[PDB]
Amino acid sequence: MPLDPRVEQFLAQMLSLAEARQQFKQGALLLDQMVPPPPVDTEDGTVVTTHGPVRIRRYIPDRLRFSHPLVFYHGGGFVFGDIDTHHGLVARLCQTVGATVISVDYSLAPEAKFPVPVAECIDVARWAAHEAPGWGLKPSIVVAGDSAGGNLAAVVSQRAKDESLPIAAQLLFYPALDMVHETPSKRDFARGYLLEADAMQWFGEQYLRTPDDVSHPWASPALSPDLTGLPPALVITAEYDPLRDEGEAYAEALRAAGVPTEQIRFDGMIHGFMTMPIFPQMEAAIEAVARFLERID
Ligand SMILES: O=C(O)c1ccccc1C(=O)O
Ligand SMILES: O=C(O)c1ccccc1C(=O)O
Protein backbone atom coordinates (compact mmCIF):
# COMPACT_ATOMS: atom_id res chain seq x y z
CA MET A 1 0.00 0.00 0.00
CA PRO A 2 1.53 3.47 -0.83
CA LEU A 3 3.59 5.29 1.76
CA ASP A 4 1.48 7.71 3.76
CA PRO A 5 1.94 11.22 2.22
CA ARG A 6 3.06 12.94 5.45
CA VAL A 7 5.46 10.05 6.14
CA GLU A 8 6.85 10.41 2.62
CA GLN A 9 7.44 14.13 3.28
CA PHE A 10 9.11 13.45 6.65
CA LEU A 11 11.53 10.92 5.15
CA ALA A 12 12.41 13.32 2.32
CA GLN A 13 13.54 16.04 4.78
CA MET A 14 15.80 13.54 6.57
CA LEU A 15 29.50 11.64 16.97
CA SER A 16 30.06 10.47 20.55
CA LEU A 17 27.55 8.42 22.47
CA ALA A 18 26.63 11.49 24.57
CA GLU A 19 26.20 13.49 21.38
CA ALA A 20 24.09 10.77 19.74
CA ARG A 21 21.84 10.68 22.80
CA GLN A 22 21.47 14.46 22.78
CA GLN A 23 20.67 14.44 19.05
CA PHE A 24 17.93 11.86 19.60
CA LYS A 25 16.43 13.94 22.42
CA GLN A 26 16.61 17.13 20.32
CA GLY A 27 14.65 15.43 17.53
CA ALA A 28 11.94 14.29 19.95
CA LEU A 29 11.70 17.79 21.42
CA LEU A 30 11.28 19.23 17.92
CA LEU A 31 8.32 16.99 17.08
CA ASP A 32 6.71 17.83 20.42
CA GLN A 33 7.17 21.52 19.62
CA MET A 34 5.37 20.92 16.30
CA VAL A 35 2.48 19.11 17.94
CA PRO A 36 2.33 19.90 21.69
CA PRO A 37 1.32 17.18 24.14
CA PRO A 38 -1.83 17.45 26.24
CA PRO A 39 -1.31 18.89 29.73
CA VAL A 40 -1.17 16.14 32.34
CA ASP A 41 -0.46 15.90 36.06
CA THR A 42 2.77 14.03 36.82
CA GLU A 43 4.86 12.99 39.81
CA ASP A 44 8.52 11.94 39.60
CA GLY A 45 9.86 9.16 41.80
CA THR A 46 12.51 6.47 42.14
CA VAL A 47 12.02 2.71 42.46
CA VAL A 48 14.54 0.56 44.27
CA THR A 49 15.40 -2.33 41.91
CA THR A 50 17.79 -5.23 42.17
CA HIS A 51 20.20 -3.26 39.88
CA GLY A 52 19.85 0.10 41.60
CA PRO A 53 17.50 3.09 41.67
CA VAL A 54 15.36 3.52 38.56
CA ARG A 55 13.67 6.87 37.97
CA ILE A 56 9.99 6.80 37.08
CA ARG A 57 7.31 9.36 36.30
CA ARG A 58 3.71 8.67 37.22
CA TYR A 59 1.05 10.18 34.97
CA ILE A 60 -2.36 10.94 36.56
CA PRO A 61 -5.30 11.33 34.15
CA ASP A 62 -7.77 14.17 34.52
CA ARG A 63 -10.44 11.47 34.82
CA LEU A 64 -9.54 7.94 35.85
CA ARG A 65 -11.49 5.48 33.68
CA PHE A 66 -9.29 2.34 33.55
CA SER A 67 -8.84 0.10 36.59
CA HIS A 68 -5.24 -1.10 36.06
CA PRO A 69 -1.96 0.86 36.15
CA LEU A 70 0.01 0.93 32.91
CA VAL A 71 3.78 0.52 33.10
CA PHE A 72 5.49 1.90 30.03
CA TYR A 73 9.01 1.19 28.83
CA HIS A 74 10.40 3.63 26.24
CA GLY A 75 12.18 2.55 23.09
CA GLY A 76 15.52 3.71 21.73
CA GLY A 77 17.46 0.58 20.77
CA PHE A 78 18.33 0.02 24.48
CA VAL A 79 20.82 2.92 24.09
CA PHE A 80 18.73 6.09 23.56
CA GLY A 81 15.58 7.66 24.98
CA ASP A 82 14.19 8.59 28.38
CA ILE A 83 10.92 9.59 30.05
CA ASP A 84 11.15 12.99 28.33
CA THR A 85 11.62 11.63 24.80
CA HIS A 86 8.46 9.52 25.19
CA HIS A 87 6.34 12.03 27.13
CA GLY A 88 4.33 12.90 23.99
CA LEU A 89 3.12 9.31 23.73
CA VAL A 90 2.73 8.66 27.46
CA ALA A 91 0.80 11.90 28.13
CA ARG A 92 -1.67 10.88 25.41
CA LEU A 93 -1.97 7.30 26.62
CA CYS A 94 -2.72 8.64 30.11
CA GLN A 95 -5.37 11.16 29.07
CA THR A 96 -7.03 9.17 26.24
CA VAL A 97 -7.24 5.86 28.07
CA GLY A 98 -7.86 7.62 31.40
CA ALA A 99 -5.18 5.44 33.03
CA THR A 100 -2.40 6.05 35.50
CA VAL A 101 0.85 5.36 33.65
CA ILE A 102 4.28 4.68 35.12
CA SER A 103 6.96 5.69 32.59
CA VAL A 104 10.30 4.01 33.35
CA ASP A 105 13.89 5.28 32.96
CA TYR A 106 15.59 1.87 32.85
CA SER A 107 19.39 1.65 32.61
CA LEU A 108 20.75 2.16 29.08
CA ALA A 109 23.40 0.26 27.17
CA PRO A 110 26.30 0.03 26.77
CA GLU A 111 26.84 1.21 30.36
CA ALA A 112 24.34 -1.48 31.44
CA LYS A 113 24.23 -4.74 29.46
CA PHE A 114 21.56 -7.35 28.83
CA PRO A 115 19.76 -8.55 30.93
CA VAL A 116 19.96 -5.65 33.42
CA PRO A 117 17.02 -3.59 32.04
CA VAL A 118 14.82 -6.71 31.90
CA ALA A 119 15.39 -7.20 35.65
CA GLU A 120 14.73 -3.54 36.36
CA CYS A 121 11.55 -3.54 34.31
CA ILE A 122 10.25 -6.58 36.25
CA ASP A 123 11.09 -4.85 39.55
CA VAL A 124 9.23 -1.70 38.52
CA ALA A 125 6.20 -3.70 37.35
CA ARG A 126 6.17 -5.48 40.74
CA TRP A 127 6.34 -2.15 42.54
CA ALA A 128 3.41 -0.86 40.50
CA ALA A 129 1.33 -3.97 41.28
CA HIS A 130 2.02 -3.49 45.02
CA GLU A 131 1.13 0.23 44.93
CA ALA A 132 -2.01 -0.19 42.81
CA PRO A 133 -4.53 -0.64 45.71
CA GLY A 134 -3.44 2.67 47.30
CA TRP A 135 -4.31 4.34 43.97
CA GLY A 136 -7.75 2.65 44.09
CA LEU A 137 -6.76 0.24 41.31
CA LYS A 138 -6.50 -3.47 40.57
CA PRO A 139 -3.01 -4.98 41.25
CA SER A 140 -2.72 -6.53 37.80
CA ILE A 141 -0.72 -4.21 35.56
CA VAL A 142 -0.68 -3.54 31.83
CA VAL A 143 2.85 -3.42 30.39
CA ALA A 144 3.56 -1.39 27.25
CA GLY A 145 6.45 -0.22 25.12
CA ASP A 146 7.65 0.81 21.68
CA SER A 147 10.38 -1.06 19.78
CA ALA A 148 13.13 -1.92 22.31
CA GLY A 149 10.55 -1.02 24.98
CA GLY A 150 8.10 -3.45 23.32
CA ASN A 151 10.82 -6.09 23.61
CA LEU A 152 10.96 -5.33 27.34
CA ALA A 153 7.17 -5.47 27.70
CA ALA A 154 7.03 -8.82 25.86
CA VAL A 155 9.83 -10.33 28.01
CA VAL A 156 8.33 -9.04 31.26
CA SER A 157 5.04 -10.66 30.13
CA GLN A 158 6.78 -14.02 29.43
CA ARG A 159 8.50 -13.91 32.85
CA ALA A 160 5.44 -12.73 34.78
CA LYS A 161 4.03 -16.05 36.07
CA ASP A 162 7.50 -17.19 37.15
CA GLU A 163 8.10 -13.85 38.87
CA SER A 164 4.66 -13.87 40.62
CA LEU A 165 3.85 -10.67 38.75
CA PRO A 166 0.15 -10.12 37.91
CA ILE A 167 -0.18 -8.81 34.34
CA ALA A 168 -3.61 -8.10 32.78
CA ALA A 169 -2.37 -7.20 29.25
CA GLN A 170 0.66 -6.35 27.07
CA LEU A 171 0.75 -3.53 24.52
CA LEU A 172 3.56 -3.98 22.00
CA PHE A 173 4.16 -1.06 19.66
CA TYR A 174 6.31 -2.20 16.72
CA PRO A 175 8.41 -4.36 19.05
CA ALA A 176 11.76 -5.98 18.45
CA LEU A 177 11.25 -9.67 19.27
CA ASP A 178 13.67 -11.89 17.30
CA MET A 179 17.36 -11.01 17.09
CA VAL A 180 18.26 -14.36 15.42
CA HIS A 181 16.13 -14.56 12.27
CA GLU A 182 15.99 -12.40 9.20
CA THR A 183 12.44 -11.86 7.97
CA PRO A 184 11.33 -10.47 4.59
CA SER A 185 10.50 -7.07 6.12
CA LYS A 186 13.95 -6.93 7.75
CA ARG A 187 15.55 -7.58 4.33
CA ASP A 188 13.22 -5.37 2.27
CA PHE A 189 12.94 -2.26 4.50
CA ALA A 190 16.51 -2.38 5.80
CA ARG A 191 17.52 1.07 4.58
CA GLY A 192 15.68 4.36 4.11
CA TYR A 193 12.75 3.93 6.57
CA LEU A 194 14.23 5.63 9.68
CA LEU A 195 15.19 2.38 11.52
CA GLU A 196 18.04 0.93 9.51
CA ALA A 197 20.07 -2.28 9.40
CA ASP A 198 23.39 -0.74 10.47
CA ALA A 199 21.75 0.89 13.49
CA MET A 200 19.95 -2.28 14.60
CA GLN A 201 23.31 -4.11 14.43
CA TRP A 202 25.04 -1.42 16.47
CA PHE A 203 22.26 -1.38 19.11
CA GLY A 204 22.75 -5.14 19.49
CA GLU A 205 26.51 -4.63 19.91
CA GLN A 206 25.85 -2.14 22.72
CA TYR A 207 23.16 -4.13 24.54
CA LEU A 208 24.26 -7.76 24.29
CA ARG A 209 27.20 -9.19 26.22
CA THR A 210 28.30 -11.55 23.42
CA PRO A 211 26.81 -12.46 19.99
CA ASP A 212 25.39 -15.70 21.46
CA ASP A 213 22.91 -13.66 23.53
CA VAL A 214 20.70 -13.22 20.42
CA SER A 215 19.29 -16.70 21.07
CA HIS A 216 18.51 -16.06 24.77
CA PRO A 217 14.65 -15.86 25.19
CA TRP A 218 15.03 -12.76 27.35
CA ALA A 219 16.60 -11.06 24.27
CA SER A 220 14.49 -12.79 21.59
CA PRO A 221 11.06 -13.56 23.17
CA ALA A 222 9.71 -14.74 19.81
CA LEU A 223 11.91 -17.88 20.24
CA SER A 224 9.90 -19.05 23.27
CA PRO A 225 8.14 -22.30 22.34
CA ASP A 226 5.23 -22.06 24.81
CA LEU A 227 3.12 -18.91 24.64
CA THR A 228 0.04 -20.43 26.33
CA GLY A 229 -1.53 -18.42 29.17
CA LEU A 230 0.37 -15.18 28.40
CA PRO A 231 -1.39 -11.80 28.95
CA PRO A 232 -3.90 -10.54 26.36
CA ALA A 233 -1.88 -8.73 23.68
CA LEU A 234 -2.26 -5.72 21.39
CA VAL A 235 0.42 -5.85 18.72
CA ILE A 236 0.68 -2.74 16.56
CA THR A 237 2.95 -2.80 13.50
CA ALA A 238 3.90 -0.38 10.72
CA GLU A 239 3.79 -1.56 7.10
CA TYR A 240 7.28 -0.29 6.15
CA ASP A 241 9.17 -1.27 9.30
CA PRO A 242 12.00 -3.88 9.19
CA LEU A 243 10.56 -5.17 12.52
CA ARG A 244 7.05 -5.63 11.02
CA ASP A 245 7.21 -9.33 10.19
CA GLU A 246 8.56 -10.51 13.55
CA GLY A 247 5.86 -8.45 15.31
CA GLU A 248 3.06 -9.86 13.16
CA ALA A 249 4.42 -13.42 13.44
CA TYR A 250 4.51 -13.15 17.23
CA ALA A 251 0.91 -11.93 17.23
CA GLU A 252 -0.10 -14.97 15.12
CA ALA A 253 1.77 -17.28 17.50
CA LEU A 254 0.02 -15.73 20.52
CA ARG A 255 -3.38 -16.05 18.78
CA ALA A 256 -2.76 -19.76 18.02
CA ALA A 257 -1.64 -20.28 21.64
CA GLY A 258 -5.10 -19.17 22.84
CA VAL A 259 -3.94 -15.70 23.99
CA PRO A 260 -6.59 -13.02 23.27
CA THR A 261 -4.74 -10.97 20.64
CA GLU A 262 -5.45 -7.93 18.53
CA GLN A 263 -3.03 -7.44 15.63
CA ILE A 264 -3.16 -4.07 13.81
CA ARG A 265 -0.89 -3.06 10.94
CA PHE A 266 -0.95 0.65 10.15
CA ASP A 267 -0.56 0.77 6.38
CA GLY A 268 1.78 3.26 4.74
CA MET A 269 3.52 3.91 8.10
CA ILE A 270 7.12 3.58 9.31
CA HIS A 271 8.76 2.42 12.52
CA GLY A 272 8.51 4.99 15.31
CA PHE A 273 5.19 6.53 14.28
CA MET A 274 3.65 6.39 17.78
CA THR A 275 6.22 8.92 19.07
CA MET A 276 5.83 11.14 15.97
CA PRO A 277 2.75 13.35 16.55
CA ILE A 278 3.05 14.92 13.10
CA PHE A 279 1.21 11.79 11.92
CA PRO A 280 -2.51 11.45 12.77
CA GLN A 281 -1.94 7.67 12.82
CA MET A 282 -0.23 8.16 16.22
CA GLU A 283 -3.53 9.26 17.80
CA ALA A 284 -5.41 6.53 15.86
CA ALA A 285 -3.10 3.93 17.44
CA ILE A 286 -3.65 5.47 20.89
CA GLU A 287 -7.41 5.14 20.29
CA ALA A 288 -6.79 1.50 19.38
CA VAL A 289 -5.11 1.11 22.77
CA ALA A 290 -8.14 2.62 24.56
CA ARG A 291 -10.57 0.37 22.63
CA PHE A 292 -8.46 -2.71 23.38
CA LEU A 293 -8.22 -1.88 27.08
CA GLU A 294 -12.03 -1.41 27.27
CA ARG A 295 -12.25 -5.14 26.59
CA ILE A 296 -9.86 -6.23 29.41
CA ASP A 297 -12.58 -5.79 32.00
O1 LIG B 1 13.80 1.06 19.91
C2 LIG B 1 13.84 1.78 18.83
O3 LIG B 1 13.45 1.27 17.84
C4 LIG B 1 14.42 3.21 18.69
C5 LIG B 1 15.71 3.31 18.14
C6 LIG B 1 16.32 4.54 17.99
C7 LIG B 1 15.64 5.70 18.41
C8 LIG B 1 14.35 5.58 18.95
C9 LIG B 1 13.70 4.37 19.07
C10 LIG B 1 12.30 4.38 19.75
O11 LIG B 1 11.52 3.41 19.69
O12 LIG B 1 11.88 5.34 20.47
O1 LIG C 1 17.02 -7.03 16.45
C2 LIG C 1 16.80 -5.78 16.60
O3 LIG C 1 16.06 -5.20 15.79
C4 LIG C 1 17.45 -5.01 17.76
C5 LIG C 1 18.49 -5.76 18.26
C6 LIG C 1 19.24 -5.29 19.32
C7 LIG C 1 18.94 -4.07 19.86
C8 LIG C 1 17.91 -3.30 19.36
C9 LIG C 1 17.12 -3.74 18.32
C10 LIG C 1 16.06 -2.67 17.96
O11 LIG C 1 15.73 -2.45 16.78
O12 LIG C 1 15.59 -1.92 18.85
Q: What is the 3-state secondary structure (H, E, C) of 198-242?
A: HHHHHHHHHHCCCHHHHHCCCCCHHHCCCCCCCCCEEEEEECCCC
* 147 among known catalytic residues: yes
Task: Locate the ligand 2 atom nearest the alpha carbon of residue 207 and give its number.
Answer: 7
Per CATH, the number for 5-294 is: 3.40.50.1820
- Report how far residue 129's alpha carbon sits from residue 165's, in angstroms, rounded to the nearest whole number: 8
Instruction: Please answer whether residues 45 and 56 qualify as being in contact, where contact means their C-beta atoms are separated by less than 8 angstroms.
Output: yes
- Structural biology method used: X-ray
Longest Cα pair distance anywhere in the chain, in angstroms?
Answer: 49
Per-domain residue ranges of the chain = 5-294
Sheet hosting strand 41-49, strand order edge to edge? 41-49, 52-60, 101-105, 70-73, 141-146, 167-173, 233-238, 261-266
Q: Which of 271, 268, 229 is nearest to 246 (CA)?
A: 271
Task: Choose one of 195, 275, 276 to mutate for the ligand 1 pocket test, by most ligand atoms within 8 angstroms of C-beta.
Answer: 195
Strand partners of residue 135: none
Give the residue, out of 106, 203, 213, 214, with the most ligand 2 atoms within 8 A of its beta carbon, to mutate for a pocket test.
Answer: 203
User: Rounded CA gap, 213 and 204, in Å?
Assistant: 9
Resolution of the deposited coordinates, in angstroms? Answer: 1.5
Residues 290 and 262 sit within 8 Å (Cβ to Cβ): no
